[PDB]
């Protein structure tokens, strides 16, 4: 009996904001949040309260503090089967991590379409707006191991397992609309080049090293996804504020047998937002779990991640109407040419109970499709289909991984497959083969049809010789990088320049930097000159003369490729640091906290120590974290209320808090005497855009602050931050 008598050890089973209560298993935090998959996992959930401690064979243990020994200072005995079971289980806890996307954070949710899509696909999950499909979603980075950091610069994975009535459909996508390479045969080359180098196993979670840029410099097809990774796309603020994409062209097949080419999209309903590099890199040190934490806490707070599924649709007759090949996974389909049609909404509303069991063991694979979908000859997609089945045999210990509970279909599954390691299902069928007469041939094949039919591949025509050959149509490398470049705002372009410059500065062999710069000069001369200036490299007259690649079907830009060009900000779920002092003006704080609450923006109250402070009117203020404990990296904005400002005015951490938030372009609001902090960040007496200031936190102060927060960062501050020592 060790719990505190007041019951404070146990978080409330109701939505609560980040930091208010200790986090908990989903089924304890939100017992009433249910779906058909979550319900189907009940057969394996194991409780604890009121139960006796036992071995795995069910024998009650009397003393879980000691090994059995001959004398209390004697040798441990081999007959101690309780010790050995317990240590054996511990000794074998780990399984191999994923070869790529080893680092990932997952949650349960549900999907529903806005309307029936039966005109274009017979897929059962898209057939009826009242059909709710449970999902399990895992977001990830790519390069680092399962214990690497979250806010690296990398591609992110966005994988969705749909538990449909006609099979599992896994939509296994990323946060950019293309990939680095064209053919799956090169995937181990690419992945080897980006991963830690083989002699010394350095660097973790970083493409900033020689072998990556060597590969890139020798394989220009990589340049398009490289631009995306060097942009702020590679450093998202949150999984909730990035886009998702299937990458490849797939097919929808309707009941009449018509094929339509499709690329899959996820639109974040919380908007697109990313970090800045210095913030992102420092954050990997101050909280390497920042995205995992933020996802889990958003869900515990009721700020459910929501995404709109969307389809870019292209008629079969239009396969050849673009300047790029639809089956080339290094090419995107500009939305200006082919709009995204809204299809439905996904809401992630419950955390797992056990991370290892549900997240670490989940298996996603893009070959897991359902009738109404089909593949194309995209030569990356084609080789993926082999990999995702094969890899589970070692990762998850054999071919029964679909019996691990998180992976199980919720719809019926029956067939003649038997045995394998870890076999859970006990087949009673007299027959293990078909055709059989001894069980009247059950289970039976099902003809294809409009609904509840068998899978039949679309009868695409194949004509050609058996060749190991890249299609000539794939042989164009620069126009899509350039389209991306020209679509970004001036600040976004600066951050891409700085991404390339920072990464190449870490490349130890200078020739590789030169060769990358030469590739940039085939994309855009401004970009290439700007990077070259940062590397102390001078372009040759020949490089200054390379003609830029063509526009993409007449487009010189497409704003949908930018994170920020078209405002789409949303402050719900965001968080503000409030820097307290030992005698806060309580009226200021009442208005601040209520304004924040009205818009669903969270606050963390910070001070130089833990415990409490007392406001002017005697109100007791609980402290969430110290200035050092919860750095400005972890918040979206900073508010300093009035009171005894002299208490913190000379505190180095308090001052640095504002400097760091200032440098990282975050809104800062200063009330009453908190305005003396202006001196620390060098603000003009008459003030500047991005700094909110007033005699008090009343009237328009909080509105002005929330407006800045809706635009995410104060991009206009960029020229001011170069001089600041932070």
């Amino acid at each position: 009996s060790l719990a505190p008598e007041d019951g404070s050890h146990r978080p409330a089973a109701e939505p609560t904001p980040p930091g208010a209560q200790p986090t908990a298993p989903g089924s304890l935090k939100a017992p009433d949040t249910r779906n058909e998959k979550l319900n189907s996992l009940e057969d394996v959930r194991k409780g604890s309260e009121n139960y006796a401690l036992t071995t795995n064979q069910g024998v009650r243990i009397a003393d879980d503090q000691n090994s059995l020994r001959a004398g209390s200072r004697g040798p441990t005995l081999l007959e101690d089967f309780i010790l050995r079971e317990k240590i054996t289980h511990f000794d074998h806890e780990r399984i191999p991590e994923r070869i790529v996307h080893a680092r990932g954070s997952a949650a349960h949710g549900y999907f529903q379409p806005y309307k029936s899509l039966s005109d274009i696909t017979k897929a059962d999950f898209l057939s009826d707006p009242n059909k709710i499909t449970p999902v399990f979603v895992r977001f990830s980075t790519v390069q680092g191991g399962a214990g690497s950091a979250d806010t690296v610069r990398d591609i992110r994975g966005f994988a969705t397992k749909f538990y449909t009535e006609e099979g599992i459909f896994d939509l296994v996508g990323n946060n950019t609309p293309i990939f680095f390479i064209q053919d799956a045969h090169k995937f181990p080359d690419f992945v080897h080049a980006v991963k830690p180098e083989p002699h010394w196993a350095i660097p973790q979670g970083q493409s900033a090293h020689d072998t990556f840029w060597d590969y890139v410099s020798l394989q220009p097809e990589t340049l398009h996804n490289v631009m995306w990774a060097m942009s702020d796309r590679g450093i998202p603020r949150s999984y909730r504020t990035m886009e998702g994409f299937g990458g490849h062209t797939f097919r929808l097949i309707n009941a009449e047998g018509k094929a339509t080419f499709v690329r899959f999209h996820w639109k974040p309903l919380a908007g697109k937002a990313s970090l800045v590099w210095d913030e992102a890199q420092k954050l990997t040190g101050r909280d390497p779990d920042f995205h995992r934490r933020e996802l889990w806490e958003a869900i515990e707070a009721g700020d459910f991640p929501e995404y709109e599924l969307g389809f870019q649709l292209i008629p079969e007759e239009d396969e050849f109407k673009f300047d790029f090949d639809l089956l080339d996974p290094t090419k995107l389909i500009p939305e200006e040419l082919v709009p995204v049609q809204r299809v439905g909404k996904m809401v992630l509303n419950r955390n797992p109970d056990n991370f290892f069991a549900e997240n670490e063991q989940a298996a996603f694979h893009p070959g897991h499709i359902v009738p109404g979908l089909d593949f194309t000859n995209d030569p990356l997609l084609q080789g993926r289909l082999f990999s995702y089945t094969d890899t589970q045999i070692s990762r998850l210990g054999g071919p029964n991984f679909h019996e691990i509970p998180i992976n199980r279909p919720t719809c019926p599954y029956h067939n003649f497959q038997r045995d394998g390691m870890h076999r859970m299902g006990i087949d009673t069928n007299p027959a293990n083969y078909e055709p059989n007469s001894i069980n009247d041939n059950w289970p039976r094949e099902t003809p294809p049809g409009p609904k509840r039919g068998g899978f039949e591949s679309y009868q695409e025509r194949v004509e050609g010789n058996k060749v190991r050959e890249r299609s000539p149509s794939f042989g164009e490398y620069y126009s899509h990088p350039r389209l991306f470049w020209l679509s970004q705002t001036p600040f976004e372009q600066r951050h891409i320049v700085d991404g390339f410059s920072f990464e190449l500065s870490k490349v130890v062999r200078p020739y590789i930097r030169e060769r990358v710069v030469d590739q940039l000069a085939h994309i855009d001369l401004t970009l290439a000159q700007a990077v070259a200036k940062n590397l102390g490299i001078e372009l040759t007259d020949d490089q200054l003369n390379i003609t830029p690649p063509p526009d993409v079907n007449g487009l010189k830009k497409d704003p949908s490729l930018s994170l920020y060009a078209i405002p789409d900000g949303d402050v719900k779920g965001r968080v503000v640091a409030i820097l307290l002092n030992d005698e806060v003006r309580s009226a200021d704080l009442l208005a601040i906290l209520k304004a924040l609450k009205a818009k669903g923006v969270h606050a963390k109250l910070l001070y130089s120590r833990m415990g409490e402070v007392t406001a002017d009117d005697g109100t007791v203020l609980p402290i969430a974290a110290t200035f050092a404990g919860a750095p400005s990296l972890t918040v979206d904005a900073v508010i300093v209320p009035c009171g005894n400002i002299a208490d913190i005015a000379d505190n180095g951490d308090a001052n640095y808090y504002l400097m760091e938030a200032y440098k990282h372009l975050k809104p800062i609001a200063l009330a009453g005497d908190a305005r003396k902090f202006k001196a620390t960040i060098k603000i003009a007496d008459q003030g500047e855009e991005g700094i909110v200031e007033a005699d008090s936190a009343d009237g328009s102060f909080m509105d002005e602050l929330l407006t800045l927060m809706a635009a995410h960062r104060v991009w206009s501050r960029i020229p001011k931050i170069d001089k600041i020592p932070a």
Copy 2:
């Protein structure tokens, strides 16, 4: 629809005699045979009728006959995920077989005590006669692989998993009361010596080779178990007709904490019975699944295997009262010194549904004990406790083998162990450690007590130095072999002689045979001389002069050591071949089958072809098998009825049938003209004991037959069989 019109593809769900119906998974054969364990397996039993064939992901298959190819004579495509899933599962079906006992056959059943044993043990499953404990029992050979033959000469295993309310108790025993070696450290050496030799992996399922006899000749502690193996104990007629023994001294612990030394026994209620060597060996070729088939068929017929659990109990103060050490596992406890107290009955009444899932994956381990039981310092048992846990990590793929359905306890199990490969249980406990406050320390330790208490080891006193040394009290090797030899009947002695003679003749290095014969002279001179004479060895003077070892506590024999000295033959479930002709006298056949039915004896009607024959009165008689297809090896007796005997009189197969049965000492009955077959087996006109003959199959002729069958074999016939060419 592929099943026949008349429904004859599907066996009736009611008990039926061997061969009347096709055999079937146990839940389909006996759907209403239930126990708590069988019921708890319902969550993983999977049916088949009326379900669609699917992938493992639940996608319906339209065509399970063809791979996806480019054109109907084209190459197979990598995007065929249906083909690859189906082939991947197939490719990974096999798991490592058991290191030893890989060949085994298992069934479900239940156990119930005769009375409360609370005076001597607190084990909950022995606390009350109305407590029914489900069991799963696997019988096995030891040497051969999972694909080897059943009726080899070998020790047999007899492992019972008890699913009790206080934990799984596994009683992991053999069909002899001792083992070959004293100390677990030598187990790999003994097992390597007996297993196929390492250069060429020969012989399978046989100790008859140089390395086994080399080890035995250099390690006289093995001689006791070697006597058992060389007797007819090594060739049981059925798993139903053999004894079981725990081998080791264990302890019972009562509620007061008093310890009593116990050895465990299983007494077969069908009595003890074995084959003879020629018949066993030939049977490994004619039906290598004979025991597996016989067990499965006995249960389907309602001839449930039944065994009485027996305890030999020795007070703690009596540890040193014998002239052998109680902890020496090469020594037996004569029942004349310590009687077997009969404590309960186990009945095996349902076959598995799927052999691989329930039998091959079952894990039995003698370290799996429950409160009320404890270990002793027996140095063979001590090292076993390490092995049976360790070996499961590769065999069953990791430390969650207890989550494999057949292995799961039926009682509660909760603890802080987490992860490992194929983790099924999803833990909701906020804590994964104790002591913890965050879950109020649950699940919690439980103090030992009279019922539902935690496990505490018996506080045995340990005094000595850390040594690798065999106890001097273990250094006596000959007196138990001799006691066993002297307790056998004369024909049992002659079969032991023949077992050593046959085995040693297959040892290629003659000096090994000589060294073994020397060891036999240390046991009994008559035995040593008889085996020497069959090997062409002459005993030396020194050898004729070896003083016999002493009697065991004044015993010059113990008839409980013989299979046959004390009659306990039971005919229920035995089988008779009836050799048909093309016009059987229907009256003979009516009386025969009626009398067999009355005693629960089964019949197989045999002929020179399949189909049916017609009796004199027009009764249509279906044929179960040919003479060659179901040899006399597979039956307990042979009856030849009257009719058109000329039809079979000149059939080599029917004559040989009789010669084979005669040679193997089986009862033979001949009615009316069937007495003309007396010529083939050289029976005088006046008849012989063990040949039943009469003008017709009257009531008397059947009683005579059935009396002979109760005595199992006609031992008096042995001196007539060596003249017989069969």
Copy 3:
């Protein structure tokens, strides 16, 4: 796709200071540095220069840029055994990391005693000041995964494999002289409490969370090693500038049979030095490979780590 004309792709095979040259595998950076164990690995070392690219079955590859397909825009074919071998190997690269000490950095070296210790031990590797024993050493943190950061606050592992003439001896110690717990039976309890919490798998590489401190508060036996971990011992400057300890009392047994209790120590010849917490924390973000890198580079420079 080829080396620069000037040979600048390749590190000089001579000792060079950190940053002067790209780092390289040991056998290429320092081909003349040998010891008996390094030489015995020669049977499995595989070179690359001037050799044809092959399958694992030795079949030369003509085109390692493409899958085999039906037409140059067609489906990939199942008969592409080159693609499938390559992808299969890649799909099966990972093995389970170590339950604890998964993050670690290792090097080869050698050991010799100053004088024969035959009076206290018959161990052959301590019997002769001129008999050298090859070693292989791995340093590590405890809590975080193989891809977690180096400069966390944690106990450090210091494991030495001595390849002696009479057997392998592994001296598997840590950088403090004790451990958190008394009986091995509690190891899973302590390790689970310090590791990322089981619902959400947070935090990596840190004891700064509720479960660890819950366990500590309820198990005062932990307080000694906790004091070490909270001190600057928990954040060393380098593996070269920490102490190592075997932790337990072992025995030495001499030829006469006499047993002496012993506790093992390693003294860093580069001296004791640690970071400060703000520095170590921010360094896990600016260079999560800092101790790994600094060990590799010290050895490439000739600043060989030395321990007594």
Copy 4:
């Protein structure tokens, strides 16, 4: 992968080629070969692109599939000629 415990089954002595074998594959359970190549990918410059592809030829050439003509639809169908 299950029978022989992982993708390095070609390093089990009986399975080993007697002719050279070199490539950029790495790791895997019970890895025996210790690779010294600074590169584990191609194309690479840091090891001058070794080990290198070899064109097909009359002897000692790289493997190239015979350029058979393929023509028909993606079908799961038995050839009638097999019936």
